[PDB]
Amino acid sequence: PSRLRKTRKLRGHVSHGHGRIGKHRKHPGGRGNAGGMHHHRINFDKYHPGYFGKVGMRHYHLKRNQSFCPTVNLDKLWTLVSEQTRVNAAKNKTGAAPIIDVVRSGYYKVLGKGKLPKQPVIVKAKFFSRRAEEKIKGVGGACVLVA
Amino acid sequence: ACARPLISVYSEKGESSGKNVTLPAVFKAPIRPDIVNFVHTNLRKNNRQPYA
Amino acid sequence: GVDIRHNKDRKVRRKEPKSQDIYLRLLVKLYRFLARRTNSTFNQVVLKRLFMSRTNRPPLSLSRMIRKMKLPGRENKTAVVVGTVTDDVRVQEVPKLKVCALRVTSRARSRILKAGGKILTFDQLALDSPKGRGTVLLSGPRKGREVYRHFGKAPGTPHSHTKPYVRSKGRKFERARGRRASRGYKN
Amino acid sequence: SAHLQWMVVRNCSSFLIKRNKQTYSTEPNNLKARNSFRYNGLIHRKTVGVEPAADGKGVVVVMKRRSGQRKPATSYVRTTINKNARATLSSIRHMIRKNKYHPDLRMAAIRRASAILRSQKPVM
Amino acid sequence: APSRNGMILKPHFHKDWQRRVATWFNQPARKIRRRKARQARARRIAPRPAAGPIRPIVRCPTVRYHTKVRAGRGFSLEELRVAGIHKKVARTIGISVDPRRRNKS
Amino acid sequence: DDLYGTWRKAASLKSNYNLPMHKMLNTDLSRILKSPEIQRALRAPRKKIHRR
RNA sequence: UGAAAGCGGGGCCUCACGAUCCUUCUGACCUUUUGGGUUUUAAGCAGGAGGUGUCAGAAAAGUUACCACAGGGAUAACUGGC
RNA sequence: GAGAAAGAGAGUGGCGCGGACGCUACGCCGCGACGAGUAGGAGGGCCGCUGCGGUGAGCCUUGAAGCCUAGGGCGCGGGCCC
RNA sequence: CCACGCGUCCCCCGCGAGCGCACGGGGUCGGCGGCGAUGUCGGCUACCCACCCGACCCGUCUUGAAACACGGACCAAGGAGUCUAACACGUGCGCGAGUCGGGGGCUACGAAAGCCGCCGUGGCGCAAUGAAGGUGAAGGCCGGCGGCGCGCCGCCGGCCGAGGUGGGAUCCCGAGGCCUUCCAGUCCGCCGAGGGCGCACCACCGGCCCGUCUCGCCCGCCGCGCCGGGGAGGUGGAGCACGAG
RNA sequence: AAAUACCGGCACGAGACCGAUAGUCAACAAGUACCGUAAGGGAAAGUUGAAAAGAACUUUGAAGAGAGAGUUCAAGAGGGCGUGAAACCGUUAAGAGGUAAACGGGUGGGGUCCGCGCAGUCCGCCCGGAGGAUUCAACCCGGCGGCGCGGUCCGGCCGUGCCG
Ligand SMILES: [Mg+2]
Ligand SMILES: [Mg+2]
Ligand SMILES: [Mg+2]
Ligand SMILES: [Mg+2]
Ligand SMILES: [Mg+2]
Ligand SMILES: [Mg+2]
Ligand SMILES: [Mg+2]
Ligand SMILES: [Mg+2]
Ligand SMILES: [Mg+2]
Ligand SMILES: [Mg+2]
Ligand SMILES: [Mg+2]
Ligand SMILES: [Mg+2]
Ligand SMILES: [Mg+2]
Ligand SMILES: [Mg+2]
Ligand SMILES: [Mg+2]
Ligand SMILES: [Mg+2]
Ligand SMILES: [Mg+2]
Ligand SMILES: [Mg+2]
Ligand SMILES: [Mg+2]
Ligand SMILES: [Mg+2]
Ligand SMILES: [Mg+2]
Ligand SMILES: [Mg+2]
Ligand SMILES: [Mg+2]
Ligand SMILES: [Mg+2]
Ligand SMILES: [Mg+2]
Ligand SMILES: [Mg+2]
Ligand SMILES: [Mg+2]
Ligand SMILES: [Mg+2]
Ligand SMILES: [Mg+2]
Ligand SMILES: [Mg+2]
Ligand SMILES: [Mg+2]
Ligand SMILES: [Mg+2]
Ligand SMILES: [Mg+2]
Ligand SMILES: [Mg+2]
Ligand SMILES: [Mg+2]
Ligand SMILES: [Mg+2]
Ligand SMILES: [Mg+2]
Ligand SMILES: [Mg+2]
């Protein structure tokens, strides 16, 4: 609201919070992001490095759907599937292992970040990390590919 | 509180009828006039026509 | 006159919360009393932490309180956060905890009451232990916010690993003259 | 409860009245009529009030009972005392002290009863 | 004239944008307009389905969405000739047809 | 309590809603403070006014 | 190089020099060239160079007595002052 | 309030019916030292104007807003009440 | 002389009562005197006038303005940091590894409000690095089968398992004791020598991921290939290192 | 065709908008008066009272204009008339005046009004003196209320408690 702002306590004060020596002029440093090479060199090097110049190849008609491959980690792997699968699989006596179809939950690639509990799985992904595969093997379990 | 009293139903003649229903837990949700004032302030701005 | 400089003549610290919440102010009305009338400094620290801002009482997570209660010596103690005990989903086995917090989220308190613990708020904490005896006081990660990635020694300045403010992370967006050795100079 | 109701009522009640650097509360069971947690007569489980009778003689003393807190009609009990000034005040003193009925304001009730009695004896 | 630290920004307001601004104060009026027209249509085609014709199972094109099956344009001609529905009688009995759909599967 | 849910039953007429938890439960401050748990573990009051 | 200890990644030390963009050359059995393959071509990645001497780096001749505008006593042509 | 870490602590054996004020805890009270200020920053306004939701069982033809005043006053002051 | 008893062991030589004065934790009188109904009493303030001291006209630009610097005859009304978008930080609120219906739909004030969940499409967040191909965030011990002038270990079965150092608010244990006649003797507290497990955070050393360089020896098979995977050691990153949006 | 856009037009409804120097330029004989050769530029300007009941009649003056009378609740609302400020002016009353006026601090003098001042506060307890009551304490009956002090009286209810 205007009732709580600073123009309600800058009435009676002549310069209205902008000064007497340096008047509040209109655009003293140019409009916008101007003068980066010339007179705002120190700001654009002390606060936005890398800004000027070209780098990298150009890819004209880019499609994020082609580049779509969202990832999940092994510490979140068991959160895809409900609790009773995990407790029935830890309770299970025949060594039957539950099947986590991660693509059905919505992640294409499985990466291995976290500690995975001592419990056999079948992780059914589209892409795997090397460490994710070896943690699934080291806990005992399978890595199934889908297309 | 954790309890729930037993609120009585009144007939149209004024006196209490025999029907007697337990008090719903909505009446023991927390009282916060901060949230009530905030929501009332921001939602009373929605029925408002422009001017220019 | 005196030769006294008045720059730091006023402490900046709070006397009260800046919230118009009334339950937090009733907790403050209780812990003002316990702070000035006990000789335990747990009451002073929890008075200070009720005073603080949302950003200075960061949300402590259930995994941190699992670890910092599984440290040796502090068995069947009472963990006490003044922020918010949030659920952590990358943990499976939850021991019997004794948690005191301003607010616990829904499936975090579901997890704790399923494991067989007990969540008591600060009023019944002061009833259960007025001087706070038998309590592991705990704090969330205060540098855990993403805005501390931008603070400190500025980017474009050597040996400063500071995240700059960019509208979109990509190839074209601030990779070229300060970042490269070919394009210009590298810091 | 009581403090929860007070943290709402303290600056928002329609009995509250603020002018001339003073503050008051025009609620019907407020001894000394001032805005306080001690003297507010709506937010408590037990409360006295001292009022003049509808007849121009005596004092009706109002007690709040224990059980019917959420029942406002059968909550207050009213006893009309029409006698001399000494025994009226001794009745109010015994009524508040020996019941142990909210002894914070027995003396405020006695002050208000004596004020009503001096206003109720004929004007010179 | 940028200050100490912050983003550098390029807001696209350099044109005359105030002369071309679409403001949405007829949003609830237009919702009530669509709703009244939808109810008048639904009671006009009176026992027929309110949502119109039937539209086939169709799964989405690209790599991001081919795990999901949605509603399509219309039942293809090979689908109709296998189901024994004539391609001109399907639109009469309420079946959406498009001839453009192939069947690779 | 079908609309806004109980404390242990969720909202049967919303999708995912439950009554919001209290921040302190025993709201009465004076009954807390005049309790033998807290009145025991205090120091003595210092109410002798020491003027200049 | 010296037998060797060592010494040397320019000149005994204190000066002798140049960002982005663009071009050119050098390097890898390198990446991309877009539905797939091969081959030219082009784009990239890293290292030099082509140069900005107003040297943290615009691409730039005058005249106005026909003159104009915003200002400056921050600054001249008078007096006055030291 | 008392120069000296810590209980006016509990257990086992050898008549007259009385007692001021307080505590809007965002309240009240006690100590000390302190008070310059342009540009500027900040806090508090029971300072002021207009309109809206609440509210005062508000005010008003037994005279509202407005205006005038050698009348009585309050506030450090913005202002305000008769 | 701020020295006052009786009783014993050793050496040299724990409650007495009253009254009262007061250089004693900030003034009281348990002292008085006058004038008061048509001219007197009180009213600082506000009306006029007098006198002493003080006293240049404001705003502004300025190193410096009363300036022979500019603006201003006087009065009434109007009259200048606003709104939208984006960002950043701080604070309040809801939920919280999630969060948000803003677009759509269903049911006087109300063009509001409620609701959707197989309307979370999508945004932001939960993962980074690389120009790109791409890859994509602990390890150790045991048993078995110089390989030799993979004590290292390649591969299989078991066990421990998700850093360390220093400082650290809080807490935890407690050598002793906190007296009412004296000794044992318990409980409830409380104080505390010293000793602990240490939140957040800070500093440092480690470690893991991505790029790049250097040196190496291995490992896999449907395609034994200009193939794929691995290690050690530096280094560049807006990373991880038990969320914080 | 549909979903879609609409500051023109016909007819509508609404407003945390403006309230006659505001809001359209325009609340009114407004794109009018007026200016420009022209293209074009373009104002100012609301309010008696409830009802005209809009001041009959007498008198001075040639008349404007007055004085009486009268309407009205009110002309202290009299045909540009609600309210009627300020600058500025006329007059009356008071006070003053040769360093232009004005100002700050301090009092003094004179006023104007106020204090309904002008024999000056009461309030408790007690003592003594003159009164007047249907009158006190204690008992009996009825109702209402407050509370292991009923350890552990009987019966219900709830649990953001548990077990069958
Ligand atoms: Mg200033
Ligand atoms: Mg400023
Ligand atoms: Mg200026
Ligand atoms: Mg400036
Ligand atoms: Mg300057
Ligand atoms: Mg600016
Ligand atoms: Mg330059
Ligand atoms: Mg001083
Ligand atoms: Mg200062
Ligand atoms: Mg300061
Ligand atoms: Mg600036
Ligand atoms: Mg449709
Ligand atoms: Mg070398
Ligand atoms: Mg030489
Ligand atoms: Mg360029
Ligand atoms: Mg010439
Ligand atoms: Mg000439
Ligand atoms: Mg000069
Ligand atoms: Mg000269
Ligand atoms: Mg100052
Ligand atoms: Mg003088
Ligand atoms: Mg100037
Ligand atoms: Mg100058
Ligand atoms: Mg200056
Ligand atoms: Mg001069
Ligand atoms: Mg001049
Ligand atoms: Mg000038
Ligand atoms: Mg002038
Ligand atoms: Mg913030
Ligand atoms: Mg409407
Ligand atoms: Mg006008
Ligand atoms: Mg007007
Ligand atoms: Mg107008
Ligand atoms: Mg006008
Ligand atoms: Mg008028
Ligand atoms: Mg009148
Ligand atoms: Mg009038
Ligand atoms: Mg008039």
The SS3 call for residue D88 is helix
Residue in the structure block whose two tokens are 């809603």 = F17
Angle between helices D106-120 and D85-97 in degrees, nearest 10:
160
Instruction: Test F24 with C33 for CB contact under 8 angstroms.
Output: no
The pair of structure tokens assigned to C41 is: 């400094």
Give the gyration radius of chain D's Cα atoms. 15
Question: CB–CB of E1 and A103 under 8 A?
Answer: no
Q: Do C150 and C163 touch, CB atoms closer than 8 A?
A: yes
Q: Enumerate residues 6+ apart whose C-beta is below 8 A from D121.
A: none
Q: Tell me the sheet residues that pair with D60.
A: D51, D80
Other Cβ atoms less than 10 A from the Cβ of D63: the count is 20
How far is the CA of C127 from the CAs of C34, C132, F32, F34, in angstroms?
A: 11, 10, 7, 11
Residue C153 tokens, joined: 């020694």
* CA gap E56, E69 in Å, rounded: 10
Q: Which of D32, D33, D46, D34 lies closest to D2, judged by CA? A: D46
For F25, the 3-state DSSP assignment is coil
Q: Decide: C24 and C50 in contact? Cβ < 8 Å.
A: yes
- Compute the distance between CA of residue C12 and CA of residue C25 in angstroms, rounded to an integer: 20
Place of tokens 């109810």: E39
Residue of E43, E32, E49 whose CA lies nearest to E96? E49
Instruction: Find how far residue C125's CA is from the centre of its chain.
Output: 19
What is the rounded CA–CA span in Å between residue E56 and residue E85?
14
Diameter of chain A measured on Cα atoms: 86
Q: Chain E residue with minimal CA distance to C174?
A: E8
Look at the alpha carbons of C7, C12, C15, C16 in this order and tell me if their dihedral is positive or negative: positive
Sheet of A99-100, strands arranged across: A99-100, A121-125, A141-145
Q: Residue D110 belongs to what H/E stretch?
A: helix D106-120
Contacts of E96 (CB under 8 A, 6+ apart): E52, E53, E54, E55, E56, E73, E74, E75, E90
Q: Which nucleotides of J are covered by protein (CB under 7 A)?
A: 3-7, 14-17, 125, 137, 144-147, 157-161
Q: Which two tokens stand for residue C4?
A: 């006294």
3-state secondary structure of D83: coil
Give the A:E interface size as CB pairs under 8 Å: 34
Give the type of residue at A143: C
Helices C106-115, C62-70: inter-axial angle, 10-degree rounding: 40
**Beta strands in A17-126, from DSSP E residues, in sequence order:** 71-73, 99-100, 109-111, 121-125
Rounded Cα distance, E35 and C147, in Å: 46
Task: Give φ, ψ of E35 to 5 degrees.
Answer: -70, -45
Q: What's the C154 CA to ligand 4 centre distance in angstroms?
A: 24
Token pair of D122, please?
Answer: 């004929």
Helix (H) or strand (E) holding D8: helix D3-9
In DSSP terms, B28 is beta-bridged to: none
Structural tokens at position A109:
């690639």
For residues C127 and C78, give the distance between their C-alpha atoms in angstroms, rounded to a whole number: 13
Eight-class DSSP state of A71 = E
Give CA–CA dist D73/D71, Å, rounded: 6
Residues D63 and D55: their CA atoms lie apart, in Å, by: 19
Asked if residue F19 lies in contact with residue B25, where contact means CB atoms within 8 angstroms, the answer is: yes
Beta partners for residue D76, in sequence order: D64
For residue D85, give the nearest of D121, D51, D124 by alpha carbon: D121
Contacts of F30 in chain C (CB under 8 A): none
Burial class (CB in 10 A: 0-12, 13-18, 19+), D100: exposed
| Tokens representing residue A107 in the block | 């992640």
Q: Cβ C177–A117 below 8 Å, yes or no?
A: no
Cβ within 8 Å of C, F 11-50: 18, 21-27, 29, 32-33, 35, 37-38, 40-43, 45
Residues whose CB is less than 8 angstroms from the CB of residue A63 and which lie 6 or more positions away in sequence, other chains included: E62
Any idea which residue has 């008075």 for tokens?
C47
C176 touches chain E (CB under 8 A): no
Could you tell me where the beta strands, DSSP code E, fall in E52-91?
57-59, 69-71
Q: Are C100 and C73 in contact (CB under 8 A)?
A: no
Taking alpha carbons only, the member of D76, D70, F3 closest to residue B8 is D70
Dist CA D113 CA C3 (whole Å): 61
Per-residue tokens: C43 = 């009451």
For C85, the 3-state DSSP assignment is strand
By CB neighbour count within 10 A (0-12 exposed, 13-18 middle, 19+ buried), where does C46 fall?
Answer: buried
Please name which of D55, D48, D41, D102 lies closest in space to residue D77, comparing C-alpha atoms. D48
Nucleotide showing the shortest C1' distance to residue C177 CA:
G20
Non-local (6+) Cβ contacts of D37 within 8 A are D3, D6, D10, D43
The two three-digit tokens of residue D71, written as one number: 């029942």
Contact present, C138 and C58 (Cβ < 8 Å): no
**Which run of H or of E encompasses A75?**
none
Label residue F19 exposed, middle or buried (CB < 10 Å: 0-12, 13-18, 19+): buried
For residue E60, the tally of other CB atoms under 10 A from its CB is 14
In angstroms, the CA D104 to CA B5 distance is 30
Resolution (A): 3.3
Does C19 contact chain B (CB < 8 Å)? yes
Contact assessment for residue E78 and residue E100, using Cβ atoms and an 8 Å cutoff = no
CA distance C64 to C87: 10
* Sequence letter at residue A20: R
Residues near A75 by Cβ (< 8 Å), separated by ≥ 6?
Answer: A113, A114, A115, A116, C90
Measured in angstroms, the CA of C173 and the nearest CA of chain A are apart by 7
- The burial class, CB within 10 Å (0-12 / 13-18 / 19+), for B52 is exposed
Q: Which long-range contacts (CB under 8 A, 24 or more apart) does D47-56 make?
A: D47/D102, D48/D95, D48/D96, D48/D101, D48/D102, D48/D105, D48/D109, D49/D76, D50/D92, D50/D109, D50/D112, D50/D113, D50/D116, D51/D116, D52/D116, D52/D119, D52/D120, D53/D80, D53/D82, D55/D82, D56/D120
Q: On chain H, which bases lie within 7 A of the protein's CB atoms?
A: 1, 8, 17-26, 29-35, 37-49, 52-57
**Structural determination approach:** cryo-EM
E22 CB inside 7 Å of strand J: yes
Q: Report how far Cα A92 is from the mean position of its chain's Cα atoms.
A: 37
The Cα D115–Cα D85 span in angstroms is 11
For E58, the 3-state DSSP assignment is strand
For the stretch C159-172, what's the b/e string if a residue is b when 16 or more beta carbons lie within 10 angstroms of its beta carbon? eeebebeeeeeeee
Q: With contacts defined as CB-CB under 8 Å, which chain A residues touch C177?
A: 49-53
Contacts of C159 by beta carbon, 8 Å cutoff, 6+ apart: C153
Both structure tokens of A65: 């759907």
**Residue of chain F with shortest Cα separation from D44:** F28
Q: Is the CB of E46 under 7 A from strand I?
A: no
Distance C86 CA to I196 C1' (A): 30
Contact F1 B2 (CB under 8 A): no
- With beta carbons under 8 A apart, name residues in chain B contacting D70: 5
Tokens of E104: 């690779």
Burial class of residue E30, CB neighbours in 10 A (0-12, 13-18, 19+): exposed
Quick check: helix, strand or coil at residue E78? helix
Per DSSP, the three-state class of A145 is strand
Task: Give the SS3 label for residue A144.
Answer: strand
Q: What's the rounded Cα separation, in Å, for the pair B37 and B31?
A: 12
| Burial zone of C108 (CB within 10 Å; 0-12 exposed, 13-18 middle, 19+ buried) | buried
- Listing DSSP states for B1-48 in one string gives -----EEEEEPTTSSEEEEEEEPPGGGGSPP-HHHHHHHHHHHTTSS-
Cβ–Cβ below 8 Å for F21 and C103: yes
Residue whose C-alpha is closest to residue C87's, from C104, C67, C69:
C104
